[PDB]
Amino acid sequence: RAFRLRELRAAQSLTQVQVAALAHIRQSRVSSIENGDIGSAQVNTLRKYVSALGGELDITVRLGDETFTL
Amino acid sequence: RLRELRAAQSLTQVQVAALAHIRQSRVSSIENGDIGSAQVNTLRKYVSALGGELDITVRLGDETFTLA
């Protein structure tokens, strides 16, 4: 979960320092995200972290029928 | 927008803030289009308070997995 993100970064030979520099976010925010502390992360920060791992972050809201993208 | 979804659920900003047990200024920024600065747990509670569910997924090609 946190392990999944750690694995994704480590499979690309990036340190938490390098991902922090790629994402323009604090290394302390990289460590906390990787320790499972997703709840507390800001959206733009999580977005940047995931882009630095080569991913895309999809944030969606399901309300009854509809599902909207934020 | 969320504003439009919130309003469509008959709720006021003060009420959603109260129901989500979050600072109203937090709801104000989310509803004014500023999703970027929202903490995931804040956005999660705000969406639950509307009666909805928040999905956060990482996509790498066709591979996806949930974060929250």
Author numbering:
A (entry chain A): 31 to 100
B (entry chain B): 34 to 101
Task: Show the paper's wording.
In the present study, we elucidated the crystal structure of Mycobacterium tuberculosis H37Rv HigA2 (hereafter referred to as MtHigA2), which contains an HTH motif. The HigA antitoxin represses the transcription of HigBA or forms a stable HigBA complex, thereby preventing the ribonuclease activity of the HigB toxin and the associated cytotoxic events. Structural studies of MtHigA2 confirmed that it has three regions: (i) a disordered N-terminus that is liable to cleavage, (ii) an α-helix bundle containing an HTH motif for DNA binding and (iii) a β-lid for dimerization. The antitoxin MtHigA2 has two binding partners: DNA and the toxin MtHigB2.
The crystal structure of MtHigA2 was determined from three distinct crystal forms. Due to a lack of electron density at the N-terminus, ∼25 residues are undefined in each monomer despite the relatively high resolution. When the different dimers are aligned based on a single HTH motif from one monomer, the corresponding motif in the dimer pair shows a different relative position. The flexibility in dimerization leads to drastic changes in the locations of positively charged residues on the HTH motif, including His54, Arg56 and Arg59. The greatest change in distance is that between the Nδ atoms of His54, which move by ∼7 Å [Figs. 1(c) and 1(d)]. To predict the physiological dimer, each form was submitted to the PISA server to calculate the strength of the dimer interface. Interestingly, all of the forms had similarly favourable dissociation energies (ΔG): −14, −15 and −17 kcal mol−1 for forms I, II and III, respectively. This suggests that the flexibility of the β-lid does not impact the formation of a stable dimer and is likely to contribute to function.
